[PDB]
Protein backbone atom coordinates (compact mmCIF):
# COMPACT_ATOMS: atom_id res chain seq x y z
CA UNK A 1 0.00 0.00 0.00
CA UNK A 2 0.95 3.67 -0.60
CA UNK A 3 1.18 6.28 2.23
CA UNK A 4 1.60 9.19 -0.28
CA UNK A 5 -0.86 10.96 -2.61
CA UNK A 6 -0.79 8.56 -5.61
CA UNK A 7 -3.03 11.12 -7.44
CA UNK A 8 -0.29 13.82 -7.13
CA UNK A 9 2.73 11.43 -7.48
CA UNK A 10 3.74 12.79 -10.98
CA UNK A 11 5.25 16.27 -11.68
CA UNK A 12 2.70 16.46 -14.56
CA UNK A 13 -0.36 15.88 -12.27
CA UNK A 14 0.95 18.50 -9.76
CA UNK A 15 1.57 21.04 -12.61
CA UNK A 16 -2.01 20.55 -13.93
CA UNK A 17 -3.53 21.69 -10.54
CA UNK A 18 -2.33 25.34 -11.02
CA UNK A 19 -4.88 27.78 -12.53
CA UNK A 20 -4.50 31.59 -12.50
CA UNK A 21 -1.53 31.16 -10.11
CA UNK A 22 -1.03 34.67 -8.62
CA UNK A 23 2.82 34.92 -8.30
CA UNK A 24 4.98 36.12 -11.28
CA UNK A 25 8.27 35.27 -9.41
CA UNK A 26 7.58 31.54 -8.63
CA UNK A 27 6.27 29.18 -11.39
CA UNK A 28 3.85 26.21 -11.18
CA UNK A 29 6.66 24.24 -12.99
CA UNK A 30 9.21 25.00 -10.19
CA UNK A 31 6.62 24.10 -7.49
CA UNK A 32 5.54 20.83 -9.24
CA UNK A 33 9.24 19.82 -9.65
CA UNK A 34 9.65 20.41 -5.84
CA UNK A 35 6.73 17.99 -5.09
CA UNK A 36 4.02 20.70 -4.56
CA UNK A 37 0.46 20.76 -5.99
CA UNK A 38 -2.03 23.64 -5.59
CA UNK A 39 -4.47 23.55 -2.61
CA UNK A 40 -5.13 27.31 -2.06
CA UNK A 41 -6.63 29.59 -1.21
CA UNK A 42 -4.14 32.30 -2.34
CA UNK A 43 -0.62 30.88 -2.97
CA UNK A 44 -0.91 27.78 -0.69
CA UNK A 45 0.57 24.46 -1.98
CA UNK A 46 0.98 20.95 -0.49
CA UNK A 47 3.59 18.16 -0.88
CA UNK A 48 2.19 14.84 -2.28
CA UNK A 49 4.61 12.88 -0.01
CA UNK A 50 5.02 14.63 3.42
CA UNK A 51 1.74 16.64 3.28
CA UNK A 52 3.68 19.82 4.23
CA UNK A 53 1.81 22.99 3.20
CA UNK A 54 3.47 26.34 2.28
CA UNK A 55 1.92 29.77 1.58
CA UNK A 56 3.03 33.46 1.61
CA UNK A 57 5.94 32.77 -0.82
CA UNK A 58 8.61 35.55 -1.01
CA UNK A 59 10.52 36.57 -4.20
CA UNK A 60 13.79 35.20 -2.60
CA UNK A 61 12.22 31.71 -2.03
CA UNK A 62 13.43 28.54 -3.84
CA UNK A 63 10.75 25.78 -3.71
CA UNK A 64 13.26 22.89 -3.10
CA UNK A 65 15.14 25.01 -0.46
CA UNK A 66 11.87 25.87 1.39
CA UNK A 67 10.72 22.18 1.17
CA UNK A 68 14.00 21.10 2.87
CA UNK A 69 13.97 24.03 5.40
CA UNK A 70 10.41 23.35 6.67
CA UNK A 71 9.99 19.55 6.03
CA UNK A 72 13.54 18.13 6.27
CA UNK A 73 12.38 14.47 6.84
CA UNK A 74 10.22 14.44 3.64
CA UNK A 75 10.75 11.09 1.81
CA UNK A 76 10.41 12.81 -1.64
CA UNK A 77 13.53 14.97 -0.86
CA UNK A 78 15.49 11.78 0.11
CA UNK A 79 14.38 9.63 -2.93
ZN1 LIG B 1 7.45 16.86 1.19
Swiss-Prot record:
BIR repeats lie at residues 11-77. Auto-ubiquitinated and degraded by the proteasome in apoptotic cells. Present in many fetal and adult tissues. Mainly expressed in adult skeletal muscle, thymus, testis, ovary, and pancreas, low or absent in brain and peripheral blood leukocytes. It is found in: Cytoplasm; Nucleus. Disulfide bonds: none annotated. Belongs to the IAP family. Multi-functional protein which regulates not only caspases and apoptosis, but also modulates inflammatory signaling and immunity, mitogenic kinase signaling, and cell proliferation, as well as cell invasion and metastasis. Acts as an E3 ubiquitin-protein ligase regulating NF-kappa-B signaling and regulates both canonical and non-canonical NF-kappa-B signaling by acting in opposite directions: acts as a positive regulator of the canonical pathway and suppresses constitutive activation of non-canonical NF-kappa-B signaling. Interacts with DIABLO/SMAC and with PRSS25; these interactions inhibit apoptotic suppressor activity. Interacts with CASP9. Interacts (via BIR domains) with TRAF2; the interaction is required for IKBKE ubiquitination. Interacts with E2F1, RIPK1, RIPK2, RIPK3, RIPK4, BIRC5/survivin and USP19. HSP90AB1. Interacts with UBXN1. Interacts with GSK3B. Interacts with several death receptors, inclusing FAS, TNFRSF10A and TNFRSF10B. Recruited to TNFRSF10B in the absence of receptor stimulation. When TNFRSF10B is stimulated, further recruited to the receptor and cleaved by caspases. The BIR domains mediate nuclear localization. This is Baculoviral IAP repeat-containing protein 2. It comes from Homo sapiens. The gene is BIRC2.
Amino acid sequence: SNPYSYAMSTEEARFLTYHMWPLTFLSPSELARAGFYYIGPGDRVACFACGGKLSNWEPKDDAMSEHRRHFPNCPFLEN
